[PDB]
Amino acid sequence: MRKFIIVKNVKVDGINAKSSDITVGMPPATTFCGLGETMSIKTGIVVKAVSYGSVKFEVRGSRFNTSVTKFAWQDRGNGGKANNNSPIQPKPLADGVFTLCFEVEWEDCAEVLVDKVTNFINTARIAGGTIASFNKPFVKVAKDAEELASVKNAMMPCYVVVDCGVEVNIFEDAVNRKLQPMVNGYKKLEKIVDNKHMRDKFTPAYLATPTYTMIGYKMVSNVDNFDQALWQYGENTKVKTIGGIYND
Amino acid sequence: CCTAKEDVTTLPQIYFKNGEGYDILVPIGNAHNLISGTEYLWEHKYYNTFTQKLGGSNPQNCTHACNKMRGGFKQFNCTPPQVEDNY
Amino acid sequence: TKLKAPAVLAYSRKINPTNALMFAVNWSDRDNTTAVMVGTKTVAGTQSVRGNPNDADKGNIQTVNFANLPHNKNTLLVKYNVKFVGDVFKAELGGGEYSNTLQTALENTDFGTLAYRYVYNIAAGRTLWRNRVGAESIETVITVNDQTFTFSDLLVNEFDEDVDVAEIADMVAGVLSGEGFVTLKVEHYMLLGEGSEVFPSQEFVENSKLSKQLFDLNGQAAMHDQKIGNAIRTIDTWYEDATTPIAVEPYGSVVRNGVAYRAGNKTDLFTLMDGAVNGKSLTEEDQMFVTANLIRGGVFGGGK
Amino acid sequence: TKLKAPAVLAYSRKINPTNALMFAVNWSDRDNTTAVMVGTKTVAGTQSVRGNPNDADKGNIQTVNFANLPHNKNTLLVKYNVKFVGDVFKAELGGGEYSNTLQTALENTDFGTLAYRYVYNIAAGRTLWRNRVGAESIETVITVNDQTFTFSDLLVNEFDEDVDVAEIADMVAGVLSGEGFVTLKVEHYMLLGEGSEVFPSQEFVENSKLSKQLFDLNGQAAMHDQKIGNAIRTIDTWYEDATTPIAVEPYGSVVRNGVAYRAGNKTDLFTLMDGAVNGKSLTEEDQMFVTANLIRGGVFGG
RNA sequence: CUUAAAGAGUCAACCCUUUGCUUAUCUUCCCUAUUUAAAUGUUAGCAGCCGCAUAGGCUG
């Protein structure tokens, strides 16, 4: 039919809050889709889509400047310099509390699914952040669009992310539409020739640059079509919602 | 002068699902969005932003845009709304 | 010929602490906790800088964050969790040959001692840093695998023998030596006195509004996960002219003081790792140092 | 040649006062404490600056914080604790050699006098600052090691000899000259009169609707721990042409009077420290001053 | 298969003096709150005895 598993109040400490060179804050949908796919690889459960919501969130630092992290020495040929503060790249970190909902292909009993999900989460991070504590995951199911609303409100309370597309461009839309940019995918700039230095020796490699959309945050309740708030991979190496652009 | 220079050290590397396969993506930043968009958000009085100076202390050793825009570049403050304490 | 190192060899960290939240309680009423909130105050002072006396007659106003115990609670309570993770040899970005022959050369490493010193730094409360200064007593409660251990005042700079530290180091070394994970839930209680200053993590920000910013999570005083981490992995008593334990660093770096105790003396992580991989023989404590660097994690760069 | 001081040589403070809370009681019913709350009031005045008489016909409105005893309580009660911490020669940040030879150069410092003058500033009520003016009587209560001590009638500006001050200073010097710590728990009772203005610490806020703002904790009038501390370490009578004791500052700075009684005459902490480490000899009072600067805390490096 | 993998912000601090917020004042007119009803949760518990008593058992 349609099965989901919800994990509420995922306290995460130490998030890599830089999603791109011009976006620092809430981890983007690409991150949670990658998390769902990591779980798919590690457990075998097929993950159709994911929906995430912020319960608490704070970037470290002040209002207009993010915190610095103290870089520790790490590279060879630096012993003649390890007696002084290591030079330093920017790496804003954050701390938060999220609620997750994964749509899954499951035919078995709920206890097995929940235990496999918990045993995966115990080995994961979220956007690099250490997972400190999460509630017991629970399963729900929906046949018609009425039970989908119950699955939706089961995440309460949290602010989930809807995709409202780009009219002009990121900057003009931020100024005029009072919305928030978000990394939604990537654009391939050039193929990388040699995998001498890559995570794989075989997987195709490309230099890329992020592609964005314009998102909005809304209380899972006030969202009508829950599909409009479920993110998954897809066309043209982007990610998007099952229900498309948000306007009910 | 518009010649490419490949270099992947220190850069992030993510897998990304391409048609039920995977490509390794190595993200790099776009100069236009920071030079132009910083100037634009400045013009149009957009304040929901972090200021981030690039190439610290010795910017001129980094990039001409970093070298001549020492005030910093504007980043979209992507903080989400928070569930209030009382519920 | 010589098995050289990859350009980058990367391991994830295996000691994963959370943030430490700071509450205030009374020493004999530990079930009525209240959060310690970060406040702001004005601070006027003098120009007591070593350089120039010509401006010591001028002042400087300043505004800073501060955090204190309430005037009706005498005990600081610090809470966090630590997750230890196995597979300490699976590289995250380094190659296969170098990393695997290194995993082979280090399988005989004393994991009992490393686990003991980690758990001991946790139980003696080294992670409390300046919050130790001037405490009447320190009481540490560690809950692991449905077991609850209590530790009273413990000597921090010596890894003295204790049966409960060892009983927890059993499971910790079991996870580190193999795979899986184990989570300790740590509480600290310090009898400091009513209204005593506590010491949350200090923020590294370019903020013109504050001269000192304390780390806060929705207004409550806290400590960075990475600072608790730097405290835990302070176990290195094996550098030359060893005095006190320092944090596991590839160069024995203590930038805090402007010295590196493993710089240019054949005892840095890279010299010892090249030795271990290229057939050389390792001391038990050189093995411990290299494997503790692997437990630390890192993105070690340079090479081909 | 010269032992240069490490660039990051720093000591942590050893006299740790808390913030002081301000209550109101009656002089003869001290078990009924009520808290003094900071309020806000409008204040209208004249433009009476020395310079311009052209604005002498113009007024000015402000809003300010204010703090009063109620009209049914006549005594101000100021409460705080002070923790003295030993190991006053172990540096916080500095390296070894400079700090170690400085520790050796000062092991003959008069710790009795230092501890006595600290405890005396606490017992004579210097820590009360402007709350001392207009008192029918002041009564200080110091509890330490399950021993209670009461003080009335102590001259603030003279270090007169007192047996209880010396007995407390004994424990304080036992901590300061060795290791460990000790907490004195201090109350001050001042018979000011019902409705008397009291003087908490003042704040600075760049631009606010308030022209004058008082330090509060949950709305209760309070004093900054650093102000109590500054009163505690007012023991320096050893600068040149010394009248009254000043607070121990490396340059003997009194920013409120725009002068520095130890700046520019080879009497500053840095000159004396360099001398002490580099072989030169110090007076007994100079050793006291340098050790008092080490107890104050601060960065002593380039 | 998460812009993956990695990281100690740290020492120290007197915000101080002074103050007139003054004068005057019309809140007025109008008004349908209506139908109907099982508190269920059978309530859900305890008073006395034997007892070395937070072992177990027994009284209408």
At C79, the amino acid letter reads K
Residue type, B60: Q
Please choose, from the candidates A42, A91, A204, A18, the residue with its C-alpha nearest in 3D space to the C-alpha of residue C299.
A91
Collapsed DSSP state (helix, strand, coil) of residue A125: strand
Cβ–Cβ < 8 Å for C303, B12: no
Q: Is C207 on the interface with D (CB under 8 A)?
A: no
Distances (CA, A) of B10 to A189, C7, C13, C249: 18, 10, 17, 19
A160 φ/ψ angles, rounded to the nearest 5 degrees: -100, 165
Give the torsion sign (CA, C67, C73, C75, C77): negative
DSSP assignment of B7-65? --TT---EEEEETTEEEEEEE---HHHHHHHHHHHHHTT--SEEEE-SS-S-GGGT-HH
Q: Is any atom of nucleic acid chain E found less than 7 Å from the CB of residue A189?
A: no
Q: Do chains C and D touch (3 or more CB pairs under 8 A)?
A: yes
Nucleotides of E under 7 A from a protein CB: 1-22
CA of B85 to C1' of E45 (A): 38
Count of C-beta atoms within a 10 Å radius of residue D247: 19
User: If 0-12 CB within 10 Å is exposed, 13-18 middle and 19+ buried, where does residue C110 land?
Assistant: middle
The CA distances from residue D217 to C41, C206, D16, in Å, are 10, 27, 18
- Residue D118 beta carbon within 7 A of nucleic strand E: no
A157-168 burial string, b = 16+ CB within 10 Å, else e?
ebbbbbbbbbee
Question: In angstroms, how far is the first alpha carbon of chain A from the final one?
Answer: 23
Q: Which two tokens stand for residue A155?
A: 């995440």
Picking from D241, D144, D150, the residue whose alpha carbon sits closest to that of residue D188 is: D150
Out of B25, B36, B79, the one facing A26 most closely (by C-beta) is: B79
Q: For residues A19 and A92, what is the distance between their CA atoms, to the nearest angstrom?
A: 10
Residues A16, A105: contact at Cβ < 8 Å?
Answer: no
Tell if A31 CB is < 7 Å from nucleic strand E.
yes
Neighbours of D44 (CB within 10 A): 8
Q: Which nt has its C1' nearest the CA of C46?
A: E13
> In the complex, which nucleotide's C1' lies nearest to the CA atom of residue D64?
E19
Of A172, A223, A201, A154, the closest CA to residue A8 belongs to A154
Q: Measure, in angstroms, how far nucleotide E42 C1' is from residue C31 CA.
A: 39
Please report the beta strands in D37-90, taking only residues with DSSP state E, as ranges in sequence order. Answer: 39-46, 59-66, 75-85
Cβ of B9 under 8 Å from any chain A Cβ? yes
Q: Which of residues 143-182 of A touch C (CB under 8 A)?
A: none
C-alpha–C-alpha distance, residues D96 and D3, integer Å: 11
Whether A107 contacts A8, CB under 8 Å = no
| Cis amide bond preceding A157, omega within 30 | yes
- C134 and chain D in contact, CB less than 8 A: yes
CB C263 within 8 A of CB C270: no
The separation between the first and the last C-alpha atoms of chain B, rounded to the nearest angstrom, is 60
User: How many degrees, rounded to 5, is the angle at CA B79 between CA B74 and CA B83?
Assistant: 165
Write down the H helix ranges in D126-202: 163-176
C203 touches strand E (CB under 7 A): yes
Task: Please give the single-letter amino acid code of residue A127.
Answer: A
Alpha carbon separation from A127 to A74, C220, D162 (Å, rounded) = 22, 24, 65
Would the Cβ of A13 be found within 7 angstroms of any atom in strand E? no
Task: Please tell me the distance from the alpha carbon of residue B62 to that of residue C171, in angstroms, as a whole number.
Answer: 48
CA–CA dist C230, C224 (Å, integer)? 10
Q: Do at least 3 CB pairs under 8 Å connect C with A?
A: yes
Sequence letter at residue A236: N
Find all residues with CB under 8 Å of A193, minimum gap 6, and list them: B6
Contact at CB, C194 and D263, closer than 8 angstroms = no
H helix intervals, A88-235: 110-121, 145-154, 170-177
Residues 144-163 of D with CB under 7 A from strand E: none
| Residues of chain C neighbouring D19 (CB-CB closer than 8 A) | 68, 195
CA-to-CA distance for C2 and C101, rounded, in angstroms?
Answer: 12
Cβ atoms of residues C213 and C203 within 8 Å: yes
Tokens matching residue B19? 């048609």
The whole-angstrom distance between residue C206's C-alpha and the CA centroid of its chain comes to: 25
HSE at residue C223, side-chain half, CA atoms within 13 A, is 25
Gap between the Cα atoms of D89 and D172, Å rounded: 16
Q: Which amino acid is at C164?
A: D
**Selected residue of B79, B85, B86, B87 to mutate for chain A interface (largest A Cβ count, 10 A):** B79
CB distance D77 to D22 below 8 Å: yes
Cα(D133)–Cα(D188) distance, integer angstroms: 14
Per the rule left: phi > 0, alpha: psi between -120 and 50, beta: everything else, D237 is alpha
Cβ atoms of D260 and C48 closer than 8 Å? no
Residue of B nearest to A95 (CA): B79
What is the identity of the amino acid at D104? T
Can you tell me which residue has the tokens 């989930």?
Answer: A160
What are residue D16's DSSP bridge partners?
Answer: D83
* Residue A12 CB lies within 7 Å of the nucleic strand E: no
Question: Distance, in angstroms, between A88 CA and closest chain B CA?
Answer: 8
Taking CA atoms, C289 is separated from C123, C206, C237, in Å, by 21, 36, 9
Technique behind the model = X-ray
Q: Which residues 47-66 of chain D have a CB under 7 Å from nucleic chain E?
A: 59, 61-62, 64
What is the distance between the alpha carbons of residues C241 and C91, in angstroms, rounded to a whole number? 32
A98/chain B closest Cα distance in angstroms: 10
Integer Cα distance of A230 and A220 in angstroms: 11
- Nearest protein residue to nucleotide E9 (CA to C1' distance) is C204
Question: Which chain B residue is nearest to residue C218, measuring alpha carbons?
Answer: B85
Helix and strand tally (H, E) in chain D? 6, 19
Neighbour-count burial of D165, counting CB atoms closer than 10 A to its CB (0-12 exposed, 13-18 middle, 19+ buried): buried
- Distance CA(C228)–CA(C249), nearest Å, equals 15
Chain B residues within an 8 Å CB radius of A21: 29-30, 33-34, 73, 75
The 3-state DSSP class for residue C18 equals coil
Kindly determine whether the C-beta of residue A9 is less than 7 Å away from any atom of nucleic acid strand E.
no
User: Of C57, C68, C256, which is closest to D258 when you measure between CB atoms?
Assistant: C57
Token code pair at residue C131 = 């919050």
**Which residues of chain D from 26 to 85 reach within 8 Å of chain C, CB to CB?**
79-81, 83, 85
- What three-state secondary structure class fits A13? strand
Q: Distance between CA D63 and CA D74 in Å, rounded?
A: 26
Residue C207 phi/psi, 5° resolution?
-125, 110
β-bridge mates for residue D149, sequence order: D142
| CA atoms of D275 and A30, how far apart (whole Å) | 63
What span, in angstroms and rounded, lies between the C-alpha atoms of C203 and A92? 12
Pick the closest to residue A53 from A71, A26, A80 (CA basis).
A26
Q: Which residues of B touch C299 (CB under 8 A)?
A: 10
Beta carbons within 8 Å of D274's beta carbon, 6+ residues apart: D2, D5
* Closest Cβ opposite residue C300 in set A65, A68, A74: A74
Q: For residue A109, give how far its alpha carbon lies from the nearest alpha carbon of chain B (Å).
A: 27
A53 beta carbon < 7 A from strand E? no
> Pairing between strand B73-78 and A23-25?
parallel
Contact D64, D41 (CB under 8 A): yes
DSSP structure class, residue C214: B
Q: Does nucleic acid strand E have an atom less than 7 angstroms from the CB of D99?
A: no
Structure tokens at A225: 């079509």
Decide: D251 and D260 in contact? Cβ < 8 Å: yes
Taking the CA of residue C148 and the C1' sugar atom of nucleotide E55, their distance in angstroms comes to 29
Cα end-to-end distance, chain C, whole Å: 14
What number of helices (H) and strands (E) belong to chain A? 4, 13
CB-strand contact D201/E, under 7 Å: yes
> Residue C240, Cβ neighbours under 10 Å: how many?
10
The DSSP H or E segment spanning D299 is: strand D298-299
Length of chain D counted residue by residue: 302
Main-chain dihedrals φ then ψ at residue D294, nearest 5 degrees: -65, -30
C partners (3+ CB pairs within 8 A) are A, B, D
Distances (CA, A) of C26 to C32, C67, D277: 8, 17, 46
Nearest CB among B24, B51, B56 relative to A88 is that of B56
Question: If residue A209 lies in a helix (H) or strand (E), which one and from where to where?
Answer: strand A205-219
Q: Give the side-chain half-sphere CA count within 13 A for D31.
A: 0
Distance CA A149, CA A115 (A): 25
Q: Which of B81, B72, B9, B5 is nearest to B41 (CA)?
A: B72
Which amino acid, one-letter code, is at C33? T
Is residue A76 less than 8 Å (CB to CB) from chain C? Answer: yes
Are the Cβ atoms of C301 and B13 closer than 8 angstroms? Answer: no
Name, in order, each residue with C-beta under 8 angstroms of C121's C-beta and a sequence gap of 6 or more. C127, C156, C231, C232, C233, C234, C235
Say yes or no: Cβ of B57 under 7 A from any atom of strand E. Answer: no
Q: C30 vs C25, C35, C76, C133, CA distance in Å? A: 6, 13, 10, 21
Interface test with B, best of C93, C206, C216, C304 (most B CBs within 10 A): C206
Are the beta carbons of C8 and B13 separated by less than 8 Å? no
Separation of alpha carbons C81 and C141, rounded Å? 11
The reply to whether D7 touches chain C by the CB within 8 Å rule is yes
What helix, strand, coil percent values describe chain A, rounded to 5?
25, 40, 35
Closest alpha carbon to D196 in D110, D67, D10, D28: D67
Report chain C's C-alpha Rg in angstroms.
22
Measured at the CA of A47, the angle between CA A44 and CA A10, to 5 degrees, comes to 100
Give break positions in chain C: residue before each, C–N beyond 2.5 Å.
Answer: none
Residue with tokens 């010596």: C158
Contact residues, chain A, for C210 at CB < 8 Å: 62
- Search chain B and give the residue with CA nearest A88: B56
Q: Residue D20: enclosing H or E segment and its boundaries?
A: strand D20-26
Q: Give chain B's radius of gyration (CA, Å).
A: 18
Q: What is the dihedral of CA A214, A220, A223, A224, to 10 degrees?
A: 140
The residues facing C34 across adjacent strands are C24
Crossing angle, helix D111-123 and helix D225-232, to 10 degrees?
Answer: 130
Resolution of this deposited model, Å:
3.0
Please report which residue ranges of chain D form alpha helices under DSSP H: 97-105, 111-123, 163-176, 225-232, 269-277, 284-296
Under an 8 A CB cutoff, do C93 and B9 touch? no
Q: How far apart are CA D201 and CA D215, in angstroms?
A: 5
Residue C95: closest CA among B79, A196, B4:
A196
Three-state DSSP class for B75?
strand
**Among the listed residues D78, D88, D172, the one whose alpha carbon sits nearest the alpha carbon of residue D129:** D78
In DSSP terms, which residues pair with D17 in a beta bridge? D82
Write the DSSP symbol of residue D130.
Answer: G
- If we measure between CA atoms, which residue out of C179, C93, A95 comes closest to residue B15? C93
Cα–Cα distance for residue pair C115/C65, rounded to 1 Å: 37
CA C95 to chain centre: 29
Residue D42: phi, psi to the nearest 5?
A: -80, 145
